[PDB]
Design an enzyme around this catalytic site. Sequence first.
Site, PDB file in Angstrom:
ATOM      1  N   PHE B  77     145.476 -70.119 -94.839  1.00 23.79           N
ATOM      2  CA  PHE B  77     145.197 -68.824 -94.214  1.00 23.79           C
ATOM      3  C   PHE B  77     146.437 -68.047 -93.784  1.00 23.79           C
ATOM      4  O   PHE B  77     146.442 -66.812 -93.828  1.00 23.79           O
ATOM      5  CB  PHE B  77     144.252 -69.001 -93.019  1.00 23.79           C
ATOM      6  CG  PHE B  77     142.876 -69.457 -93.416  1.00 23.79           C
ATOM      7  CD1 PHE B  77     142.023 -68.605 -94.102  1.00 23.79           C
ATOM      8  CD2 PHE B  77     142.445 -70.741 -93.127  1.00 23.79           C
ATOM      9  CE1 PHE B  77     140.758 -69.023 -94.487  1.00 23.79           C
ATOM     10  CE2 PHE B  77     141.180 -71.168 -93.505  1.00 23.79           C
ATOM     11  CZ  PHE B  77     140.337 -70.308 -94.188  1.00 23.79           C
ATOM     12  N   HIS B 187     131.958 -68.345 -93.817  1.00 25.49           N
ATOM     13  CA  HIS B 187     133.367 -68.082 -94.036  1.00 25.49           C
ATOM     14  C   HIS B 187     133.789 -66.825 -93.274  1.00 25.49           C
ATOM     15  O   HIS B 187     132.992 -65.902 -93.099  1.00 25.49           O
ATOM     16  CB  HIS B 187     133.624 -67.908 -95.530  1.00 25.49           C
ATOM     17  CG  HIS B 187     135.055 -68.073 -95.930  1.00 25.49           C
ATOM     18  ND1 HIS B 187     135.967 -67.041 -95.876  1.00 25.49           N
ATOM     19  CD2 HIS B 187     135.731 -69.149 -96.399  1.00 25.49           C
ATOM     20  CE1 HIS B 187     137.143 -67.475 -96.292  1.00 25.49           C
ATOM     21  NE2 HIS B 187     137.026 -68.749 -96.618  1.00 25.49           N
TER      22      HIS B 187
END
Lengths: 112, 229
Positions: B77, B187
């Site tokens: 990320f 998500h």
Amino acid sequence: MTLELQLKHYITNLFNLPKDEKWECESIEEIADDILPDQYVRLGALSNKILQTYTYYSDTLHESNIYPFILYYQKQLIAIGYIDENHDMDFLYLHNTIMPLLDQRYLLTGGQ
Amino acid sequence: NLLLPDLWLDFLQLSPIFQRKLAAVIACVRRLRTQATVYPEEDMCMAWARFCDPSDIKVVILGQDPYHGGQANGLAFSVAYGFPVPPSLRNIYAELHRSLPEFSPPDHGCLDAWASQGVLLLNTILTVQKGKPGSHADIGWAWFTDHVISLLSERLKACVFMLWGAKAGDKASLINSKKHLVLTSQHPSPLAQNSTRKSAQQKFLGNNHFVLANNFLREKGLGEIDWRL
């Protein structure tokens, strides 16, 4: 890379964004049921299919509160569009693995 | 050379055959690197393992594969300083800001301070060819990161695992959910943000995972994470 360039041209023209600003991409896989509107996800079609996704971002894209995206299922094009300021998905193209559900690709420079 | 720090080699206690299998995956990536651009660089694909001792890991966050446009930094990320914040990371920041009054969303995507505090930012696939998401999904990284997850569950006394989306959620069966807190949700991607009042799974925004994680750590007598960036 043709489709990404057509989408970038369309979005930068629609929202009057700098044509030369670099777009970056975030790609994640996720089932269609979690990322597409309920009306477009049906048993025997998109339901329970894992899509490969491309979501484009940049400084001015973030300023405009839009997320252009392209979705695929294996090698099949599934969607072209963008998430708008109200977080609503607006489709230039949508295909449910069986047939096109939405097709405004004439707004793109492809001739489709 | 298994590219891993010595503390991780000690932690994993890889059998000789598992050492050879990992070496073979590394060799595969080395072959692919001469034919095309591969992200991240070889000496950054294990960066996620270099920010703390593995015995000190308190939170595991799973990603899929690295960013494929040069912004990957070997952490899930996160992006390097100077790069625009990707959409999923923005939504992570949004949930942190909702759930934690002292958290203010930063202007960067650098998660180094989390990693240094024992947050393991683990992509299940550790390399990717430029512009081709999933291109290295079948070269053997998944076996390695599955084993890493299993060993974290086995060897750590108490740990939090944050599984966002279907792909990460598939890893839950690797984790001992009696020892460890397994937090699941949809998500954080903006694609999954606004959807259907149907999803059996809870939405990312509102999942409260960072608060629940620190509550767990406090209950187990471990130092809480300072999520601020």
